[PDB]
Design an enzyme around this catalytic site. Structure first.
Site, PDB file in Angstrom:
ATOM      1  N   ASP A 106    -118.157 -11.087  13.617  1.00 32.30           N
ATOM      2  CA  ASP A 106    -118.345  -9.770  13.004  1.00 32.30           C
ATOM      3  C   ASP A 106    -119.465  -9.774  11.975  1.00 32.30           C
ATOM      4  OD1 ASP A 106    -116.625  -8.207  14.435  1.00 32.30           O
ATOM      5  OD2 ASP A 106    -114.893  -8.628  13.155  1.00 32.30           O
ATOM      6  N   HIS A 140    -114.814  -4.975   8.961  1.00 34.07           N
ATOM      7  CA  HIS A 140    -114.006  -5.906   9.755  1.00 34.07           C
ATOM      8  C   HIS A 140    -114.112  -7.325   9.210  1.00 34.07           C
ATOM      9  CE1 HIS A 140    -114.413  -3.068  13.530  1.00 34.07           C
ATOM     10  NE2 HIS A 140    -113.892  -2.463  12.477  1.00 34.07           N
ATOM     11  N   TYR A 144    -110.982  -9.903   7.017  1.00 29.67           N
ATOM     12  CA  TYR A 144    -110.386 -11.231   7.188  1.00 29.67           C
ATOM     13  C   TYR A 144    -110.366 -11.981   5.858  1.00 29.67           C
ATOM     14  CZ  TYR A 144    -111.793  -9.977  12.014  1.00 29.67           C
ATOM     15  OH  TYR A 144    -112.116  -9.289  13.186  1.00 29.67           O
ATOM     16  N   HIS A 234    -116.684   1.071  19.894  1.00 24.16           N
ATOM     17  CA  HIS A 234    -117.970   0.374  19.809  1.00 24.16           C
ATOM     18  C   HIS A 234    -118.410  -0.150  21.169  1.00 24.16           C
ATOM     19  CE1 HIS A 234    -117.091  -0.628  15.288  1.00 24.16           C
ATOM     20  NE2 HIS A 234    -117.297   0.663  15.502  1.00 24.16           N
TER      21      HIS A 234
END
Lengths: 327, 328
Positions: A106, A140, A144, A234
């Site tokens: 990401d 995104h 994490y 996406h």
């Protein structure tokens, strides 16, 4: 000519004048988006016009992605602390490593992968959409770290990031994608982006979906589903724009792009077996992970307009994992 | 178009990574790079962003503030300005539509290349993420001028203003002057240009809605402009802050080059503003106050870069009504 370092780079070009006119149709047709200027010095640059939509799909995708805006701060991740502590040592270590690997993909898409799609975009509204998608891909990646901040020790975070840098197969996976973002062919960039959004993270997403199917890490799973809600659009949009560029290419180019797509997919699939096969080696859900990988590979291909590669038998995801996909 | 067969992966040109898995030692971590740096460092190991390892605390603060300030034009009741808009003259309406189309062009440029080209040579990985937020919000700024047009303007009025912008040579010279610097390989030239865009180039245009608000007109549009200004003030501060972080590691030779380049770029952009906005505002009695406001913000752009002010207090005296309009 050459330039002294104190001079303006535009002094190498012919200046525009001081004329003012109301551009006619030809002048408007020859105008370009700012991201195309570097290939067309002396062309006139046009502001984005959201009251002149070229492809209605762009307005629909823009509105939907913006309406789905979210932040990890809004998910009560700290309510997963008891569940996290109830896992085994191996489960916790594997989660940090898997999620650090997802962070790496990401990070790549946010900071170069989605952005390299702008300059050869079909429409100016599509260019604006890529700026939203890249920001959300930064969200995104950031999310994490939000998980790690809630659940993990400094030592756990530190080792996971060192593991990621030190993992040769992970490095091969991400650099395979990054090289295609440099491609001279804009449609190869779109294929790679569609693969990232619709395929490359799903062996990793299997793990929190598995936890959720077992009743664990429930709030983390909500956040994963927010991520997936974004990535589904996406990848759909990447593949749609690929197909709109593809229909203008020659037959020979279409043949080569399909061969390239299958070459890229096969290489990335074999790398996933190597990478996630090793990560999940101490877990008994090995076979189901790759049913799930092949299942999403078919979706990535369909997003690009290509037929499914894997059969029903090769894509039979357990019903508990599929149930965990929806809220 | 290279000679590599089109079916081959571009990574096939590079020696592949092995099959080892190690916990990277300090030397391996120090040599790892961000994804955006991979293009001219093939074979290097790429590192995921770590928001639990902040390199510059200012990055965390700026990220948190910009995200907290997220907004969308749909939340502003622009349609409540329709009576005020119709109370203006035709010249006031035409001037507003054209000015805002010119602002749209600058934000379109920053959103789709100007801010994004700051990522590859960013000082920190968190700064790279911040640029993705800033570029998105610049797309929102550009979008928001279209929201105004959709609420207030006829199809013919919008169409003519976009034709005016494409056909305005001086506007084209302004935008392409900045776009050319984003092609420099010197990251600090890119940073200076971005600081000029966010801290200077739109302010002759922003003057106009601030002027209306000071006269009690276009009040809801003014709220949205203040949302845009709330972003741009941080964008320009942050661009200039990062310029200074890079500048202090440069040789004395490069520092001297960059200061002269900055003054050359400012002087050129200022003259172009006089030509561009001077023509647009020729029919208005606030024409001279506009350039006090331009010089006032030029000083802020310089200050954001760490350079001394160029214009004196007498050349930067903005009328109290305009300064008050900057506040809710």
């Amino acid at each position: 000519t050459a330039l002294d370092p104190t001079e303006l780079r535009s002094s190498l070009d012919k200046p525009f004048g001081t004329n003012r006119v109301i551009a006619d149709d030809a002048m408007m047709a020859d105008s370009i988006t700012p991201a195309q200027y570097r290939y067309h010095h002396g062309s006139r640059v046009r502001p984005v016009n959201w009251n002149n939509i070229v492809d209605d799909k762009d307005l629909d995708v823009w509105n939907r992605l913006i309406a789905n805006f979210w932040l990890p701060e809004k998910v009560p991740l700290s309510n997963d602390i008891p569940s996290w502590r109830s896992l085994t040592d191996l489960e916790r270590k594997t989660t940090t490593r898997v999620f650090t690997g997802l962070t790496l993909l990401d990070t790549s898409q946010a900071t170069i992968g989605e952005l390299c799609q702008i300059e050869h975009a079909r429409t100016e509204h599509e260019q604006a959409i890529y700026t939203n998608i890249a920001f959300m891909q930064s969200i995104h990646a950031r999310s994490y770290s939000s998980i790690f901040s809630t659940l993990c020790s400094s030592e756990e975070i530190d080792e996971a990031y060192r593991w990621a840098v030190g993992n040769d197969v992970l490095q091969q996976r991400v650099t395979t994608v990054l090289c295609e973002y440099e491609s001279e062919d804009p449609l190869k960039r779109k294929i790679a982006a569609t693969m990232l959004s619709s395929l490359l993270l799903y062996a990793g997403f299997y793990l929190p979906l598995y936890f959720a199917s077992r009743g664990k890490m429930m709030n983390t799973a909500d956040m994963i589903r927010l991520i997936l809600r974004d990535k589904a659009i996406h990848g759909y949009y990447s593949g749609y724009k690929f197909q709109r560029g593809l229909e203008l290419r020659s037959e020979n180019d279409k043949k080569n792009l399909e061969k390239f797509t299958m070459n890229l997919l096969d290489t990335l699939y074999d790398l996933e077996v190597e990478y996630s096969g090793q990560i999940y080696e101490g877990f008994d859900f090995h076979d189901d992970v790759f049913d799930f990988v092949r299942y999403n590979a078919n979706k990535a291909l369909m997003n690009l307009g290509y037929p499914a590669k894997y059969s029903e038998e090769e894509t039979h995801v357990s019903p508990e994992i599929l149930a965990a996909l929806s809220p």
